[PDB]
Amino acid sequence: MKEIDELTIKEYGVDSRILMERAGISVVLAMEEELGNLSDYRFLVLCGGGNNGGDGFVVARNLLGVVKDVLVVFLGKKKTPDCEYNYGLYKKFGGKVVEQFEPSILNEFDVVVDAIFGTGLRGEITGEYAEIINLVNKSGKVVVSVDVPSGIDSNTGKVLRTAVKADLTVTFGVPKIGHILFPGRDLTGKLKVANIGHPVHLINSINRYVITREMVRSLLPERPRDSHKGTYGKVLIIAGSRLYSGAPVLSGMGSLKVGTGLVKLAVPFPQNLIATSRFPELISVPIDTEKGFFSLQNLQECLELSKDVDVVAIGPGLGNNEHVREFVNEFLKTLEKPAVIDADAINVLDTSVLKERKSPAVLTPHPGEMARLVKKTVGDVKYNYELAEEFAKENDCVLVLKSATTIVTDGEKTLFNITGNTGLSKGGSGDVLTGMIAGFIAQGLSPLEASTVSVYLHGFAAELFEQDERGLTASELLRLIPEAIRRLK
Amino acid sequence: MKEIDELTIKEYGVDSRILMERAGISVVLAMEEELGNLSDYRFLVLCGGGNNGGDGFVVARNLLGVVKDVLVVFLGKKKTPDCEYNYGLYKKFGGKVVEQFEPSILNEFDVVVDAIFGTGLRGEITGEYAEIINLVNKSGKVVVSVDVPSGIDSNTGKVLRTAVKADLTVTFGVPKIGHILFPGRDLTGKLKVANIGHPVHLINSINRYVITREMVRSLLPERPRDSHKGTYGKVLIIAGSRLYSGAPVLSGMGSLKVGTGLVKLAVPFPQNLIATSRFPELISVPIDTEKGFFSLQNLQECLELSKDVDVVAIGPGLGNNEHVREFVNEFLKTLEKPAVIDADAINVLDTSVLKERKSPAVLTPHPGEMARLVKKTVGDVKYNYELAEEFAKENDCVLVLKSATTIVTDGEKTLFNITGNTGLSKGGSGDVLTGMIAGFIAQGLSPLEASTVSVYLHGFAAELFEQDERGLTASELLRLIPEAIRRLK
Amino acid sequence: MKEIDELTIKEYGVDSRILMERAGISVVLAMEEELGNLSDYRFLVLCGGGNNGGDGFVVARNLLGVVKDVLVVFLGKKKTPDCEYNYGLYKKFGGKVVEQFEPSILNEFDVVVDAIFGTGLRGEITGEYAEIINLVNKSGKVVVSVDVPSGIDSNTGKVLRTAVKADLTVTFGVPKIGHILFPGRDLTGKLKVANIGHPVHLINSINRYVITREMVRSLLPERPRDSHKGTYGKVLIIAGSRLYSGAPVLSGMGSLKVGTGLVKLAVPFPQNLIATSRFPELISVPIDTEKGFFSLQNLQECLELSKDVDVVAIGPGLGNNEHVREFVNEFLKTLEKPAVIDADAINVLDTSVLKERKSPAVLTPHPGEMARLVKKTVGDVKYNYELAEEFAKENDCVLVLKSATTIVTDGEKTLFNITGNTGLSKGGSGDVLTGMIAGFIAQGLSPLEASTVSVYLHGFAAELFEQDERGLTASELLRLIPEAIRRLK
Amino acid sequence: AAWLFEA
Amino acid sequence: AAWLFEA
Amino acid sequence: AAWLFEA
Amino acid sequence: AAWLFEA
Ligand SMILES: NC(=O)C1=CN([C@@H]2O[C@H](COP(=O)(O)OP(=O)(O)OC[C@H]3O[C@@H](n4cnc5c(N)ncnc54)[C@H](O)[C@@H]3O)[C@@H](O)[C@H]2O)[C@@H](O)CC1
Ligand SMILES: NC(=O)C1=CN([C@@H]2O[C@H](COP(=O)(O)OP(=O)(O)OC[C@H]3O[C@@H](n4cnc5c(N)ncnc54)[C@H](O)[C@@H]3O)[C@@H](O)[C@H]2O)[C@@H](O)CC1
Ligand SMILES: NC(=O)C1=CN([C@@H]2O[C@H](COP(=O)(O)OP(=O)(O)OC[C@H]3O[C@@H](n4cnc5c(N)ncnc54)[C@H](O)[C@@H]3O)[C@@H](O)[C@H]2O)[C@@H](O)CC1
Ligand SMILES: Nc1ncnc2c1ncn2[C@@H]1O[C@H](COP(=O)(O)OP(=O)(O)O)[C@@H](O)[C@H]1O
Ligand SMILES: Nc1ncnc2c1ncn2[C@@H]1O[C@H](COP(=O)(O)OP(=O)(O)O)[C@@H](O)[C@H]1O
Ligand SMILES: Nc1ncnc2c1ncn2[C@@H]1O[C@H](COP(=O)(O)OP(=O)(O)O)[C@@H](O)[C@H]1O
Ligand SMILES: [K+]
Ligand SMILES: [K+]
Ligand SMILES: [K+]
Ligand SMILES: [Mg+2]
Ligand SMILES: [Mg+2]
């Protein structure tokens, strides 16, 4: 993005003042769209000394004469050249500027435009800057942030001591990672992405994308009329234990509800019988076990069951103990099919095994399992997309790191998912996702594509729940999945 | 309340006649609201000699000239000063008063205003007073009671020999306990609470409240966007036996449907498998038992399962025998987590154990289990809020005493719940409640708050059932819970 | 306007490239608004070598990558600096430019953007430029003109040999006279006025305005509740003859329908009786005449009738002969009230009389009467706002020159009216207007204000006619007037 | 609509 | 809805 | 209606 | 609805 602006000025030849003008007017238009007619409102524009503030000056100047009142509070010391220019325009146009903030000031304005810091923020905000942000946050006024709410680090989404909470953020060219990852995602409020005149080839060159409806629509496999269950693939899910008899059911149904032709579960007897008593469509193979858990004595039966399926999912509700550990690593070492490795299969996994595998793999950890997997803290891995990138690349796999914003990466391409809600914050929801991913691989999507489509549809199904989200359970989510698919087209 | 009137006159300085005027006109306005234009109706006002009757005289006087007909039947001997004053006003204004009731009289009137007795009722009603109340009750006329239907003891809700059955009750300042507890709640009909000019600080000073929509809305925990199942807590439910394989399922789902992140049941094998066959989202741990019931041999397994959960519910469908008794009391004595103690765990409980506990507890008895618990009759404990108060305070716990009006108390604060209907009068409904309470504790509400929110939402879900209430079952109630939550906001 | 751009660059400091960028993007946004999503369309941008063409290059460049196809046909020889700059940007961005137009080219495009000439057009278009405009006009494609359709002289509305016919014109800052006067008004199609960043004080400084709904709403006199016919004024209308018995009725009703309190007509007997037989509310004074026309023998009767009225309208249907001439000029010379001089009173008027008058006057000629009045051809005066200005100023009057676009001027302020339709192209419609103007003067609006409000409301009433406009008659128009007023607020 | 009455 | 355009 | 903004 | 107020 810094790249993008520079190239658009330096190689394409667009005057930096023109980009700055387009930036500011796009903020005005976004506010009009969100607030209706702007002439009834009084606007307090907060401008730093950088180009974020310059953008602010453009906004203030364009409100002059058209709205009830404009005031700029200039908070910087030095001004960049474009900020200086635009400051001089605002003044020539008759705009009033002050240099000291008095708490009482929010009293006489309806909208605060936050142009203090954007992508040029470095390190923590303190001093006057922090007080003013805390005042704005306590004011209950409408807050529109220019580019990113001031205080959010645009590369990570972290709050640098304190940050503005916006009702509306107008960002330029492309969403920034700090709009996408929390807490920043929360502080952004409603996000508008404005076209300010970058050539389209530059906008498209960016390595990380948010997963969209259009991308997922184009990835959904085709349903030829002359087809049968074989057309849509077979999944084996190796799952469950005597502690967890339900997980396998949720995974298997996740596969069926996204359109897989045939799903076989392998589950310790008698827990395997639980699946068909809820959903008779599922096939649930009883695996004879010594203590209610998969072990090495079951290895050959499972490789045999895997011989004429398209994909194998393993992990949900297996339990984490040494017999499971032995079994999972020998299985994965010998299985020459794509694998979706989840849950307790991740908790026992030996990552050397992923390197010596010829067939592909998707790993689906929440941060707690990722932390354990790479031997780091939850805090070190949460939302750490570069870490996920390095791991996907080292181990020749797709890593789906699950959280309110899920990261899907293969080490080259990284995608962020922003669908879903807190109804998914409840056990079972991940077990469903695993089945969805395995299912899309069975139907012919690549691992990365299957994962992109699945995370998106899984979150969208949760949002379609009719009642309060907190009451959503995994069984209900399964039922919403084909509605999500329909609404997708 | 007697306190309240006295202080409003004696310390704040509001003339008692003014309070009485505001009382009476609030009755007129409440009737207009309920009946439409009052001028088509004929009103028979029944006035005792107390201030309830004085309030009646204010009503009658204010109807003079505006309605088809007013008649007062004055039933008292002496009059209090404000009743005397208002009697004299009614007469000066031209109102007609008689002193003898003739059964034939109800014939020529449409509305009976019942101002015979309010909070000054002492002991049983007999003699003329009883006959007249029984006549009014047989008349099929519209009955509006001033303050409380005459015959209801305003401190308990008991009928003192006989009582008026009202279509509408207008009470002053705050609801009286006798409007809230049955039978009085039934005899009150539709209740309006009128502001007659008490200062608000006095109205708010009252120790007992009815649980309202607004109170429950403010107590619902937050759902931060960046969250996961851990954010919303973990519950262990120790439940079931070979006699009762279903109870644990209803408790576990009750927890999940109010937004708990993770629910583990511990249930004797093979009954534990019943839970996941209905709801695979649940985790149901098989507990190995000798005869199909928890005993001391299971104590250590359960303490272990309790180590990284937030709350433990125990009791639903455990069975009541000596092995269960030993197990429950040793468990609760050692468990250092908040406990929700229900059902058969209450039936075996040794209350010394609650005193020696450092962690908190909520007990959820119906009157039959409370009676047994304190060794009294059902009749002695039913609706006995002072008894519940004393028990909560002695044992350092929250007591939720369940009935059509549920009492929630911690010995200091007492709350009454008035949502729900007879569809909850059917096995399973309590087992659901236990899970709901455990769930809200898991999410961070205090025991008392979790219980307040739960009793309210549980009754409101029952009322949302689409078909006749009597056909409601606990499974359907679970499905209604997230609708209740949504309607709450 | 040339003034405006220059000052905005040279004194306010706005880079001319920035104004040009805002110009072009405002064209893109106006097209999106009018056409919906632009990505389905192919655009042929026609660029001259001036700044109009530069604006075109901005448009083309901003469509690159977002729409099906862009092509520029560059038609100029030299480029101005901003056109050169923007040409270079379009190319860098990957835009394709050709320099020769092939008739077959319109075939493969859906929208022609016309940026050949704007306000820099000088003299007639011939050569390649004319052929290309004639091709576009024969193509049936959607045509969007940048600033003004190429070929319209922006100061007069004249076509310079040939001109583009647009579906949409996006003009910058303010409407140009050439959008307002015909034929240019016709060639403009739907007109959008874009804010490109001129300071508002400059935009407002312009001497000529289009009459708007908001201006007319603020001018409508107040209707105090405690009022009577005297509050709203009295009008005398001196009108009619034995040739024209209807004109006076239409004028008198025009006065009443805009809210005048009292209208007296003076009309030769027996023609005066026609008025009250249609509208009995009118007062119609029989004037005794020798041959059916006003003459000098009626002068004193009319001055007498004028003594306690607020305004006098004279002219509609008087007839044009020497007795009328003598009478009108002696009357106007002596009448010391505001006069509305219309129709045959204009045809006989001696303009020296307007100079020697102390009281005010509004003249309401169509071009045929203006031509005669200043002794010029219809062609010389039609839409000649400078001529009208000079005449209003020389004679101390308001001149309302009537046509599809009516000019209202007092020599300092000139207003253009753009309401109305061809249903007003039918006798009687002017006679109604005269009464409307006299009425608003009677109610207290200045001559210029009365005329501004009247021309607007008169055209708006015609547009409210329910059936085909061509069937509208003056009687129906009278009925629509109070609907126009209501819709105005 | 709540100054006089609460339900 | 009037900052950019007047009709 | 998408030239300026994407949501 | 007319005991308190007439309009
Ligand atoms: N119905 C069922 O049968 C269910 C079984 N489940 C199974 O239970 C087993 C254990 O899975 P768990 O995820 O509970 O525990 P894990 O042991 O795999 O997770 C490690 C710890 O990380 C923490 N954690 C979880 N999500 C986190 C997040 N988003 N951010 C930070 N920390 C987080 C948890 O507190 C957990 O204790 C798996 O086999 C899983 O399939 C779960 O899917 C729950 C539902
Ligand atoms: N589906 C299931 O598995 C169910 C199991 N249940 C379990 O059955 C066991 C016994 O519970 P119960 O309540 O039946 O019996 P309890 O032995 O706990 O109750 C004692 C007696 O009190 C009486 N009683 C119940 N509610 C009363 C009230 N509101 N007022 C006055 N008296 C009342 C009953 O007649 C009952 O016989 C518990 O473990 C409970 O969890 C019940 O929840 C019913 C549903
Ligand atoms: N119902 C009636 O009694 C009517 C009587 N009318 C009266 O008829 C008399 C003569 O008025 P006229 O306007 O017919 O003729 P005038 O003699 O005043 O007009 C001179 C000529 O100019 C031409 N002309 C009219 N409008 C023109 C325009 N917009 N552009 C160019 N040329 C135009 C006409 O061809 C007309 O012959 C007036 O006293 C007028 O009040 C007219 O108002 C028609 C209705
Ligand atoms: N607040 C939230 N917003 C969006 N998605 C969520 C949220 N909480 C959880 N999820 C999604 O729910 C699923 C949780 O998976 P996992 O943590 O494996 O839990 P489980 O094993 O409990 O099924 C993931 O897809 C995760 O990204
Ligand atoms: N008529 C009623 N109105 C409102 N609530 C009721 C009614 N009958 C029962 N309930 C509620 O239903 C639940 C019954 O719980 P409990 O008596 O423990 O029965 P169970 O063990 O049968 O589930 C309690 O919350 C109680 O207050
Ligand atoms: N096509 C048109 N569009 C708008 N207004 C029109 C049109 N034709 C005529 N008018 C209006 O109708 C009225 C005609 O007045 P006038 O020419 O004095 O005719 P008359 O004497 O026939 O009543 C004027 O207000 C004129 O501006
Ligand atoms: K900012
Ligand atoms: K009473
Ligand atoms: K043009
Ligand atoms: Mg999981
Ligand atoms: Mg119970």
Ligand SMILES: [Mg+2]
């Ligand atoms: Mg005319």
